[PDB]
Ligand binder design. Sequence first.
Ligand code: HEM
Ligand SMILES: O=C(c1cccnc1-c1ccncc1)N1CCC(O)(Cc2ccccc2)CC1
Length: 436
Amino acid sequence: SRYEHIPGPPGRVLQDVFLDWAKKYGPVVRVNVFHKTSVIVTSPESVKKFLMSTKYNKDSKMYRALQTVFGERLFGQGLVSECNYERWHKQRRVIDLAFSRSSLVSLMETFNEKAEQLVEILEAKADGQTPVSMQDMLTYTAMDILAKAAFGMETSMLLGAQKPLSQAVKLMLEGITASRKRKQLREVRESIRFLRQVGRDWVQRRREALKRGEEVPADILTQILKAEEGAQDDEGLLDNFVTFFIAGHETSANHLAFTVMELSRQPEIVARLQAEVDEVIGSKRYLDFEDLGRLQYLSQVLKESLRLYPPAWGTFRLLEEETLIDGVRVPGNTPLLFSTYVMGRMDTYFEDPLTFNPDRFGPGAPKPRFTYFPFSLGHRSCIGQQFAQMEVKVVMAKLLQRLEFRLVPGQRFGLQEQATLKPLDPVLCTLRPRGW
Ligand code: HEM
Ligand SMILES: O=C(c1cccnc1-c1ccncc1)N1CCC(O)(Cc2ccccc2)CC1
């Protein structure tokens, strides 16, 4: 009854219900998420106010679902789910060093190598008949890239290795959203314990390598270890291991899958993308850093994919004191939900919101002002945004260079929600090599 005055109700996901409600009830709406009343805020004025300030911090009660799942510590107090500013700021600044310009440029080989491996696997299946799950294939590529890039490990999922790990990740992701029977609880808990134990194993290996005096290239793991340099235990270290292990591939994978799915019904845009890749990189097997900037139309297409299909759909901030938010009195101690998914699909912010038009992001176009934030905004924006943007460009360019994709009829364009948003179907495609 402290929220009853707030406007709201008395392959389709919860985020679409939020969209319906935002359109019907306005820019500040009372909802239910994780059994706590929150308020969904969809004006750009409020996006700017709350996301662009260090006065407003993440709401720990909303992130509890990431911290622990059915009594098993998952993301814990790692970089995403830490809600105390000062503890967050300490780890952010140390881990930042692994995402410097020069750190990222040195990852171009890993990106090219895994992309080339994926494409060679796909080319062998390109008979215009064999159904290929592009969701699965892109997920394996994202994982292999992340494992190598962040941790110096070879998962070899593209070779069919690590099935138990891919199961662990899948069951864990389902559990996050499920917590919003007996056998599900057992499977979820064991999967989370498995992921942390992988963490312990890889950490010990890294420590052993350093002890024996072997070469260890400075990576995300190096800075994560640095962030914990005199902690009383390894729990903080394991929290970040799991956080980056998951966050570092899941959404890149989803983003790739959504893009391939959408592009399957956009032959004109595909022909333009094929033409750009042919002109910028020709037959080069390897994309250089400077080539990435020249794939301008591809950049625009990936931005438009994220407008309609943001895998990371939202973020929460704690409103501490009663505040007037677009003409609505919102009580203190209230979680505010900001959703780039909802805003992206509102005709108030985007003309013909359901039309896929890369020209929205053209060099002369008016830039969206606080209506588009697939990597969020402000101090809690995605640390891996540029890592992600580079990796998906490399993967997309290499697919476009070499293969034609047709979505198998019956495959749907609808969404599912498992912490993140992702294609409902496995994006089954048949493939042909480019050039007949
Ligand atoms: C297209 C791919 C990606 C998308 C769409 C994305 C999106 C986001 C969003 C929306 C947030 C804010 C989360 C929140 O407020 O709760 C975030 C934060 C974060 N992301 Fe990503 N991300 C992507 C890729 C990555 C990658 C590749 C990494 C690591 C290699 C990563 C690691 C993180 C971390 C550690 C945070 C917390 C940052 C902080 O609070 O300081 N993400 N990301
Ligand atoms: O922490 C994650 C995450 C969860 C699972 C896999 N990956 C990532 C992730 C990938 C890339 N960058 C950051 C993080 N996300 C993505 C989910 C939401 O945006 C909202 C959300 C908040 C609370 C509970 C569920 C959902 C939040 C932040």
